[PDB]
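assembly run, all chains below
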Amino acid sequence: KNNVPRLKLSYKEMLESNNVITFNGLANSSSYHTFLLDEERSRLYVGAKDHIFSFNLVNIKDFQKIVWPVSYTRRDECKWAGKDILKECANFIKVLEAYNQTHLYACGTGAFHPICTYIEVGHHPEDNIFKLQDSHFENGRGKSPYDPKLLTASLLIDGELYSGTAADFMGRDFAIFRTLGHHHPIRTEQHDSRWLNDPRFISAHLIPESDNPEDDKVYFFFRENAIDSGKATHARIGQICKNDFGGHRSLVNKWTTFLKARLICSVPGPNGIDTHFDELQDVFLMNSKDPKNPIVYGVFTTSSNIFKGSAVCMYSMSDVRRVFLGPYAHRDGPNYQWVPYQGRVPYPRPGTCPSKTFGGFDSTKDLPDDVITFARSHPAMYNPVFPINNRPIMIKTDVNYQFTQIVVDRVDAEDGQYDVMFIGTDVGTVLKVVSVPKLEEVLLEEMTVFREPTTISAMELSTKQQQLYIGSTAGVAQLPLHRCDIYGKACAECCLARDPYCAWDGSSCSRYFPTTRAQDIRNGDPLTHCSDXXXXXXXXXXXXXXXXXXXXXXX
Amino acid sequence: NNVPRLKLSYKEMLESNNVITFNGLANSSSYHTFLLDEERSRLYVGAKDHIFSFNLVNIKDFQKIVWPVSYTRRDECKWAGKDILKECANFIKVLEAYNQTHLYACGTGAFHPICTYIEVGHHPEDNIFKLQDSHFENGRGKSPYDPKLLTASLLIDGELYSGTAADFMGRDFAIFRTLGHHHPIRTEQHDSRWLNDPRFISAHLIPESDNPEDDKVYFFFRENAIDGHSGKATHARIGQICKNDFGGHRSLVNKWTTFLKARLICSVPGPNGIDTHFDELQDVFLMNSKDPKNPIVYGVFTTSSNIFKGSAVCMYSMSDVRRVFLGPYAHRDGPNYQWVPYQGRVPYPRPGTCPSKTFGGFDSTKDLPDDVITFARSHPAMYNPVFPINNRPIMIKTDVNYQFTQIVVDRVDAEDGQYDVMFIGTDVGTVLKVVSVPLEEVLLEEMTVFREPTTISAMELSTKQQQLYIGSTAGVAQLPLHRCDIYGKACAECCLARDPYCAWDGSSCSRYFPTRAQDIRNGDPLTHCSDXXXXXXXXXXXXXXXXXXXXXXXXXX
Ligand SMILES: *[C@@H]1O[C@H](CO)[C@@H](O[C@@H]2O[C@H](CO)[C@@H](O[C@@H]3O[C@H](CO)[C@@H](O)[C@H](O[C@H]4O[C@H](CO)[C@@H](O)[C@H](O)[C@@H]4O)[C@@H]3O)[C@H](O)[C@H]2NC(C)=O)[C@H](O)[C@H]1NC(C)=O
Ligand SMILES: *[C@@H]1O[C@H](CO)[C@@H](O[C@@H]2O[C@H](CO)[C@@H](O[C@@H]3O[C@H](CO[C@H]4O[C@H](CO)[C@@H](O)[C@H](O)[C@@H]4O)[C@@H](O)[C@H](O)[C@@H]3O)[C@H](O)[C@H]2NC(C)=O)[C@H](O)[C@H]1NC(C)=O
Ligand SMILES: *[C@@H]1O[C@H](CO)[C@@H](O[C@@H]2O[C@H](CO)[C@@H](O)[C@H](O)[C@H]2NC(C)=O)[C@H](O)[C@H]1NC(C)=O
Ligand SMILES: *[C@@H]1O[C@H](CO)[C@@H](O)[C@H](O)[C@H]1NC(C)=O
Ligand SMILES: [Ca+2]
Ligand SMILES: [Ca+2]
Ligand SMILES: [Ca+2]
Ligand SMILES: [Ca+2]
Ligand SMILES: [Ca+2]
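ok done. output:
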């Protein structure tokens, strides 16, 4: 399930051949981690240390910036709090999502006093404003963490900010929060490992269930510690009802819809001891024709220090729902095994949204007390969620690096459509991989996008611009989703490359458009399609005249 | 985790007289079942349809007993469905000394296990190797029917302890005693609390006191975890029986009452506080100290995963092990309960404790009260696991594509002092020679002992002959424990080699006996010797110059 990359471009190869556009970043900043892509304006907003940037999608070297650090007073408290002056004692932006048609909402580590603000961007004729509207500063507790090292799932829909993070200086009170207008702040329970057990949040997504948008749910993806003998990590998926408002007598201003299930990403072994990849890292939804069933792509890595491994698992939303409808997890006590619950599941079912249609019940505060006391105590489901085909799409263990981030384009090619994964790496590398069905992953290329290795922290994709954007504390990098010239001048090579983007021009290898032209994504032999030492790898060499084959062609 | 200093391919070895090879009889295989007998300097080996008697000086000199099954039996086995070449024969699986003139031998009987005695002389030496015949004893519970299943076996006071499958179907695992003056005794049956589909590895009589009624038999093995819920898992285990355990009065008639088992843990602490485990036990090798009641258990372990191949060597203290077998028993009130350290009243005498004549009076296991028999009927497992000396492996091997299979350890008396030299076999037909320098493992050499890769199944060591003997289905191989010439002609190199066996002669690098100049710690030639693609591999090259630390540089050209 490993591969050898077909092509391998070092940073220098890249920059000389104009693949990368680099932002080395401001010398008084770092942590260019918090991405927000806005196609409407063609801009890539980025939250960093003491700044937010507004990058032009056409070329990130063209940008504006907002300077938004904390006061001297605050720098000083944070210092004497003990914290590291360069890495902790500043305003590290951690949250940056759209708000109304003219504003973003932004939150940052406030040198361990989290804070928020709005940022003016235009509406659609006039919209390259980047004004930092000032002296509101809202409180960032439960929105951004105090610690920059902690990450934070966040999602902002209907002017309300959902966010999973630590609520406290000490960095231990984790929770999913809703804040901002029109309703009392709601969160998960507190000091209750059944709900969340020292978790690390990764992303959150509003996924519609029906055509009625009161049925709408918010899905959080994260990882946490198992409750048992042996310390362990469980990857998790989490469910809230958009329109959940808290309970009447119990669970006042706390979720009642909260349910969570384990994500399993494991490779079946011969002994029937599977190999698990429990450390969730990025998640990326791929939108299908149905907005109620995106295809969840998830990046996972081994828990072990000794063995470095990485994995990519796909997950079906109807698979996930089955799990959230099946048996709840249960014990009669602390000294009991966890067990599928077969008592009476109170009605309406915990997990189900309030509706105006079925049940009658118009709110979460109209709920009976017995559905509230269940789910107070059965937040976890019993069944785990398994990937499509109970296997990873892809495994990477032979090698010394780990996967960090992912995005996926849906390239419309000659044979058909193909899902092209771009995977970031804790060594500053991107893998471009094609899922060609029968699946076969074909590792097209492995590119180095930073002068020096750093972990890639963020990756976003612009189909309009055909570009890929990358984050790290070192800076931001820009990539074309394809440069088809890079393969051969000859036909043979452009066909062999197996690149959904790249078809044979006639004259020389270039972008493929619908409706002359001759690529082969399956199989990829130049013979039946092109009608005419060290190469780039995956070809074996023979001296007789050097040769290269694995179709064949001399050198 | 290391790079081997030297690496000898099979050819290098055979050309330089390191290996003596037995490619084995063409109508045989599975040269797996070793019995070393220093007294009459011979290495007995149980194979497919034969037992061999190899001369320890040179295994090319040998005798053999031909002991296959009848036509009748070949024929049943065939029609039982079994593979004619790999299953339908007498694969010897057990071969231990019996009295001063006899061995006891047992084999897969083409899925009808059988045993026999083998005459060897009184001491003399008279080299008898007579197969005493037509008395064939029943091999059930002694050898398995399946050749692929392994079997711990130990024979002391004319009684054969053995852990294996008792049945054709290969599922009824148990520790057995047979050949008694006493009724046959075994573990319980169909009870995963006791043994849960285990794979036995070796068994050892380890004295507790000076009174040899306190003697215990320790089995080393692995098995499946019991959960309660799913994650399938392997636990490495150590197991305890009382030599003189005879069964219970009313209950556990002719079954062990002394049986207790504990988990062996061999794990590397991780930064997140998720340790990395090596649960698959493979070989075990006791190293005898001045105290025969505390040998140092060396154990070879590998990962359970298919995807990630890893291997590990963990040492274990016998006083560590005993603490565990005296501590809390494992317990549940039911199937849906967590396992829990037992804090009820532990009936007396303690389950696990041997019958003695000294204290209490109680002269047997059948004199035991019924309440100590009903406990231990149900608490055969201990709660605490056993951790290695320093909660770490001695050595880890994960970067590489092979796994460890077998081990032995010599205690080389060197100039600086004593050093424990591990020889480790490999599922690729390779031996690693490793030195534990005090902590630091130094991978002296990595040798290939079979023309083609096969798993090493057996490894035995002869200090008298200074030789190492290896097993596989392909055959048997012989190694000198040292060939000191192999390093440099110069002093520098022989010192650098860090080999307990090898000191600098004066004239040229040779064996060390109690003018010499070795350095095992550190190993720098400067303070000890007062005189391109390098030969070494832990040396770096600045072009061709050569420099390794332990820094020590010298101009290679
Ligand atoms: C597997 O392969 C080998 C063949 O490569 C085979 O070994 C042969 O076995 C037989 C008996 O097992 C040996 O017979 C012996 O031959 C010597 C000559 O040096 C004789 O002294 C003896 O022959 C007599 O054996 C009995 C003596 O008590 C008499 O009853 C009988 O009349 C025999 O004539 C002695 O036994 C033969 O030498 C070996 N040797 C070799 C080098 O092959 C082995 O049996 C095969 N195993 C099987 C089929 O299980
Ligand atoms: C981190 O480093 C940066 C230096 O690399 C700092 O950037 C400076 O930030 C200050 C205030 O935050 C700006 O002050 C402004 O002055 C401009 C003057 O016009 C300038 O316009 C462009 C911007 O498009 C600028 O690049 C030119 O130098 C022009 O002179 C006024 O528009 C405003 O009134 C405002 O006060 C500096 O322009 C800006 N300079 C540079 C070179 O970046 C940043 O403040 C540092 N942050 C810290 C220490 O927290
Ligand atoms: C060692 O054991 C073997 C087998 O038990 C003994 O061999 C037999 O001894 C019996 C009496 O016990 C006699 O009838 C025969 O002389 C032997 N026959 C066979 C087929 O083995 C042997 O005597 C014992 N040797 C000792 C104690 O030195
Ligand atoms: C967007 O929100 C801000 C207040 O946070 C406000 O000043 C601005 O007018 C808003 N725009 C709307 C509601 O269109
Ligand atoms: Ca977002
Ligand atoms: Ca991402
Ligand atoms: Ca053979
Ligand atoms: Ca033995
Ligand atoms: Ca062994």
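Chain A touches chain B through 29 residues (CB under 8 Å).

The two ends of chain A are 30 Å apart (CA to CA).

not gonna interpret more than that til we talk
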